[PDB]
Amino acid sequence: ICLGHHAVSNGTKVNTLTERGVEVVNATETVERTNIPRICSKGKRTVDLGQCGLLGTITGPPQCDQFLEFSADLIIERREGSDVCYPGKFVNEEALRQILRESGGIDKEAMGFTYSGIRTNGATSACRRSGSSFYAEMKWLLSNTDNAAFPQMTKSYKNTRKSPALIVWGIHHSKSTAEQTTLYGSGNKLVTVGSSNYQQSFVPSPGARPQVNGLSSRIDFHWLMLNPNDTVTFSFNGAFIAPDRASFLRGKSMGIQSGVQVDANCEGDCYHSGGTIISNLPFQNIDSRAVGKCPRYVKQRSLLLATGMKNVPE
C-alpha cells in the first residue's frame, strides 16, 4: 500500500516567497479587473444633475430649476453640467462641491430681505426663461434709474434654525466703468460681509473679459456657512447680487462624476467615472480614484492566490 496526493494535467502558476511560477492544483484571483459600465444605483435615491452644475443648485440658473431643493443619497455630476448662466465663477468652488456632494441634498428658506428705493428685477438674456430672467435664488439689485446713485445699505439675516445656513452672494463686474456707473451710480463700490466667524470685503473691478454667452462682464459668487443663532450682515453700495434664500443640508450622501447611464437593476457601492466596481476581491486595478466602499487599488493587474497543493504531474 502507497500514500499519495492528487495532481492535474494543466495547473496554475503562482508566486511564493521563494519561487516564481510554481504550479499549484488551483488558484483564485485577488485583483478585480471587470467593470460594469453603469452607475449601479439600485436601492438609492439618485439625482443625476445632467446639465445642472452642482453649485448651480444653490443659485439657480435655468438648467437647475428642477434641482433647487433636491434630496438624494447618491449625486451624479455630468461633464455637461454648468453652475452658471451669466458668466462668472465661485470662489473656493471645490470646497463647496465637496460639502454639497455629502449633503444629502438641500432645503431652501427665504431669508427675508426687503428693499425700497431701488430696482430689484435685474435680468439677462443669458438666463432665459421665456425671455430674460436671472438666477432664481438671487436678486440683481440696481439703481432705480440709469446712473442714479445706489444708496449705501445694510441687510442682515439671523439663522434661526438648528443647522448651519449656506449663504451665497455675488459681486457684479460690469464690462466697463461706464457700464458700472449706469447700473449702480459712479464711484468705487464696496460690499462687506461679516458674521461671528467671518469677515471679508469686496470691490468690483469693471473691465473687458473675452465674450462668454455674449457678455464681457462676470458675476463672482461667494459663500459662507452661518451657524445656528449667528447673524450675517451685508453692507453694500452697488454691484451686489443679493441672496433671496438660504440653503440647509438635508443629511448625508455621496457624489460622483460619471459618463455612464444609471442602472436601477444592479447594486453597488464603489463608483468611478466609468461605472461600478462590484467585487468581493480585496484589491482592484481599474481606477485609483474610485470612491465609495472600494477594494484597495493596486498597480498589479493580477495576483493569484493558491487554493490547492503544489501540482506535480506525472
Binding site: 500500500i1 502507497c2 500514500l3 499519495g4 496526493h5 492528487h6 495532481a7 492535474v8 494535467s9 503562482v14 508566486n15 511564493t16 516567497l17 521563494t18 510554481v22 499549484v24 492544483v25 483564485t28 485577488t30 455630476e77 461633464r79 453640467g81 468652488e93 471645490e94 462641491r97 465637496q98 456632494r101 455629502e102 455621496m254 457624489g255 460622483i256 462624476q257 467615472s273 476581491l281 480585496p282 484589491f283 485609483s288 480614484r289 470612491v291 465609495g292 466602499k293 472600494c294 477594494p295 484597495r296 487599488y297 493596486v298 498597480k299 498589479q300 495576483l303 493569484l304 492566490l305 493558491a306 487554493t307 490547492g308 497543493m309 503544489k310 501540482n311 506535480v312 504531474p313 506525472e314
Partner: protein, 168 residues
C-alpha cells in the same frame, strides 16, 4: 515544501485521484484499488477555505472625492493630493504582493504537512507489522484482502491480530 512529502519522497500526485486530495493506492492479491481519505482532504480544504473567508471581506470605510475630473483643482493642492494617493498606492501594491506570496508559501506548506500527518499516522497503525519503502508506500509483510486494507483506511486495523505472522 518544508515537509518533504509532496514533491519530495512522494514522486507524484495521482491524476486519477478525482475523489479527494489524498488517498491510498493498494495492491494485494485481488489487484489494485484506489480510494481517497476524507479527513486529511477536509482538513486542508477547511484551512484553505478559512484563508479565503478572511481575504474576501468588507471594508466599510467610505472615501469621498477630494479632487476633480472635470474641473481640475488648484495645482499645488492637486500635486499634494496626487503625491499622497500615489504613496498609498505604493503601500497597497506592496501589501497585496507580500500577502499573496506569504499565503501561497503557507498554503503549499500546509498541504505538504497534511500528507506527512497522514503518512506518519498509518505507519504507526501498522507498527512493526510493516516496514516502509521510501517512496510513500508501506511494504506489508502480512498480506490481507480488501476488507483488511479497508481496515487500514478507516483505522480499524488491529496490528496484534497479524502481529506474529508479519514479523515472521
Amino acid at each position: 515544501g518544508l515537509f518533504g512529502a509532496i514533491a519530495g519522497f512522494i514522486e507524484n500526485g495521482w491524476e486519477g485521484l478525482i475523489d479527494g486530495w489524498y488517498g491510498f493506492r493498494h495492491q494485494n492479491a485481488q489487484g489494485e484499488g484506489t480510494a481517497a481519505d476524507y479527513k486529511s482532504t477536509q482538513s486542508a480544504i477547511d484551512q484553505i477555505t478559512g484563508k479565503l473567508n478572511r481575504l474576501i471581506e468588507k471594508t466599510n470605510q467610505q472615501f469621498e472625492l477630494i479632487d476633480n475630473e472635470f474641473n481640475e483643482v488648484e495645482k499645488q493642492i492637486g500635486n499634494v493630493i496626487n503625491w499622497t494617493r500615489d504613496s498609498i498606492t505604493e503601500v497597497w501594491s506592496y501589501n497585496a504582493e507580500l500577502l499573496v506570496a506569504m499565503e501561497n508559501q503557507h498554503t503549499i506548506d500546509l498541504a505538504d504537512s497534511e500528507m506527512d500527518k497522514l503518512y506518519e499516522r498509518v505507519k504507526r497503525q501498522l507498527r512493526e507489522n510493516a516496514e516502509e519503502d521510501g517512496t510513500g508506500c508501506f511494504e506489508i509483510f502480512h498480506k490481507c484482502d480488501d476488507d483488511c486494507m479497508a481496515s487500514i483506511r478507516n483505522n480499524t486495523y488491529d496490528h496484534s491480530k497479524y502481529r506474529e505472522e508479519a514479523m515472521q
